[PDB]
Write a protein that binds this ligand. Structure first.
Ligand SMILES: Nc1nc2c(ncn2[C@@H]2O[C@H](COP(=O)(O)OP(=O)(O)OP(=O)(O)O)[C@@H](O)[C@H]2O)c(=O)[nH]1
Ligand SMILES: Nc1nc2c(ncn2[C@@H]2O[C@H](COP(=O)(O)OP(=O)(O)O)[C@@H](O)[C@H]2O)c(=O)[nH]1
Ligand SMILES: [Mg+2]
Lengths: 304, 291
């Protein structure tokens, strides 16, 4: 059994990747299950075993000859989020179909349900391809559900690949959307970047690609890809030569001036931010971040 | 001469187009799937380090195309050839034929460009199991060496490669470091840079490809390529920001800066807090000599 806080459901046709996905996610969620459960344990709602638990469901080619029995429904309710895996290797029209079904049916029984859809196995595909692929899929459901009479259902679509970093960036948002109890940290970040020359901030555990938290800033610029890799640079470059700022830190600046800043926060937990200075030089732009950061750092040190 | 012509030959699927694509076109490993078989000879050039330019000849290896390079256009192909990077797919079944074709190429070279440098790559080594990866290379290089020897070119260089690790950069670094004439002055200038920085060591990379040009010093022997690889992986995550890499400082110990529109330097500093300012200054005088 599993006394977890959330109950995600992974459904899709056989070989969509629903089991491979569980393996990659369950692993990277450890640093968090750890972090939010005791590193810092507060919401009385937290003394649980692990944050989430991915229960997968196999989906038959076509759901005509069959529809969900009751036991499935009783599960839908227990489930907090619903992740639909569309294998992009093949055609996906009848799949977009079975999705409208799984939605309408699930939604009657447990609205307020998160419906997340993964346009999977997108590794090795041209960009204008992923563009059309999605834009086309996104539309084909905004019509399939207007036909089913429910255009008000909020559906978030993602572009993923388990040989990529995508599935981690998707699930990062996915986990956040699920558990609100872990948003106090998102909030502390909206403060760090609040009134800033700082655009985005992530809280990455050195051994997980599922960020632990980041700002509520809407214009997520998918700056995730960039910061997520920055960690690896820092770790990897450091690991080769190794034989209020006493820890690990890395700064990088591009042509146009943007800055990728990483500063360790608490034993393996680092902060990666994007800093944009319109002319203002680096040396001091960097010092003014340190202020808001060193503050934020104390904040985590206080609750730990 | 000021221009270099390299022959990238091998049979179809050897993975030689993925190479070029990763090394001079900013492709990601898995990004090569979409490449599709190259038809005939696909040309690419690249001004490398200012004074030297490069002309890459990716020769689609479908048997038919291959037969035509050796017959009709052999003079076109094997004419004025600086280097031959022949590639063998480690997962081939037609190994013996794979090698014959190689001789075929040597024949046309032993004749039209005899002083060309020979380089062989056992590509896709990521498919072989670790315990085997070495003896197979040893075995293959052994045979290839003798064949190479009989067509003029005695001692050739070998490199086990895969688009999935850094072993690809080491090979292409050494290959390109063969067409660079002026290396005496670079190390000499580098060595001095070292001392004025009193660094553990300094490395030089080509801004564009991030291949190693030279250095000046226990430590990882493959460290050079692992640096190339990692920075190139950073390069690619920084796509969306659509800005090129300028600088990076890691723990007040490792400084990586661009020197000119051609060379980037990597300095591991030996200290932890030399006035960051006075260290950067030393960086700015360095540009004078590495443009
Ligand atoms: N496992 C593994 N696969 C590779 C490697 N390099 C390339 N590939 C794969 O092999 C394929 C071979 O494609 P190419 O590189 O375009 O073919 P080519 O060798 O250039 O030959 P062309 O058809 O003849 O002209 C691509 O589909 C890649 O996914 C490698 O290092 N390891
Ligand atoms: N190229 C690619 N292959 C994938 C991806 N996800 C899963 N696979 C492969 O798809 C196959 C089926 O995955 P699996 O987890 O067994 O599917 P399941 O039956 O739905 O659990 C395996 O060979 C996986 O390695 C992906 O994102 N990209
Ligand atoms: Mg090719």
């Amino acid at each position: 059994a599993t006394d977890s806080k959330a109950m995600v459901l992974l459904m899709g046709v056989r070989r969509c990747g629903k089991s491979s996905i569980c393996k990659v996610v369950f692993h990277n969620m450890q640093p968090l299950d750890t972090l939010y459960l005791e590193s810092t344990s507060n919401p009385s709602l937290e003394h649980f075993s692990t944050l989430i638990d991915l229960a997968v469901m196999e989906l038959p080619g076509q759901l005509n000859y069959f529809e969900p029995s009751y036991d499935s429904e009783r599960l839908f309710k227990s489930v907090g989020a619903l992740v639909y895996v569309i294998d992009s290797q093949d055609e996906y029209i009848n799949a977009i179909t079975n999705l409208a079904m799984i939605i309408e049916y699930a939604y009657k029984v447990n609205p307020s349900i998160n419906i997340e859809v993964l346009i999977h196995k997108v590794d090795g595909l041209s960009e204008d391809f992923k563009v059309d692929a999605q834009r086309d899929i996104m539309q084909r459901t905004g019509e399939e559900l207007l036909e089913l009479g429910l255009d008000g259902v909020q559906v978030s679509f993602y572009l993923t690949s388990i040989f990529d970093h995508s599935i981690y960036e998707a699930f990062s948002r996915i986990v956040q959307k699920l558990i609100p109890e872990l948003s106090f940290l998102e909030n502390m970040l909206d403060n760090l970047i609040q009134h800033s020359k700082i655009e985005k901030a992530f809280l990455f555990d050195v051994n997980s690609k599922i960020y632990v938290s980041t700002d509520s800033n809407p214009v997520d610029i998918q700056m995730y890809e960039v910061c997520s890799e920055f960690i690896d640079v820092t770790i990897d470059l450091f690991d080769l030569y190794k034989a209020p700022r006493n820890e690990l830190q890395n700064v990088s600046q591009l042509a146009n001036g943007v800055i990728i800043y990483l500063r360790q926060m608490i034993r393996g937990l680092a902060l990666v931010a994007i800093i944009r200075p319109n002319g203002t030089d680096m040396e001091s732009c960097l010092t003014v971040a340190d202020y808001n950061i060193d503050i934020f750092k104390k904040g985590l040190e206080d609750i730990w | 001469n000021n221009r270099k012509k390299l022959l990238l030959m091998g049979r179809s699927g050897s993975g030689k187009s993925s190479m070029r694509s990763i090394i001079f076109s900013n492709y990601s490993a898995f990004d090569t799937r979409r490449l599709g078989a190259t038809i005939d000879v696909e040309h690419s050039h690249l001004r490398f380090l200012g004074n030297m330019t490069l002309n890459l000849w990716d020769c689609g290896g479908q048997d038919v195309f291959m037969e035509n390079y050796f017959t009709k256009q052999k003079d076109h192909i094997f004419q004025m050839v600086q280097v031959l990077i022949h590639v063998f797919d480690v997962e081939s079944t037609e190994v013996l034929k794979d090698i014959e074709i190689f001789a075929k190429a040597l024949k046309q070279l032993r004749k039209y460009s005899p002083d060309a440098k020979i380089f062989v790559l056992l590509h896709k080594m990521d498919l072989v199991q670790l315990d085997k990866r070495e003896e197979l290379f040893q075995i293959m290089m052994k045979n290839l060496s003798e064949t190479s020897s009989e067509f003029g070119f005695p001692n050739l260089i070998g490199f086990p490669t895969s688009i999935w690790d850094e072993s690809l950069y080491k090979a292409w670094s050494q290959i390109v470091c063969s067409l660079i004439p002026n290396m005496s002055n670079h190390q000499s200038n580098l060595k001095k840079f070292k001392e004025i920085m009193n660094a553990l060591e300094i490395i030089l990379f080509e801004r564009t490809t991030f291949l190693v040009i030279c250095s000046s010093n226990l430590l990882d022997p493959k460290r050079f390529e692992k640096i190339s690889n990692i920075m190139k992986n950073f390069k690619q995550s920084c796509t969306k920001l659509k800005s090129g890499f300028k600088t990076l400082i890691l723990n007040n110990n490792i400084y990586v800066s661009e020197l000119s529109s051609n060379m980037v330097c990597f300095i591991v500093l030996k200290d932890m807090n030399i006035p960051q300012e006075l260290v950067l200054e030393n960086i700015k005088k360095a540009k004078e000599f590495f443009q």
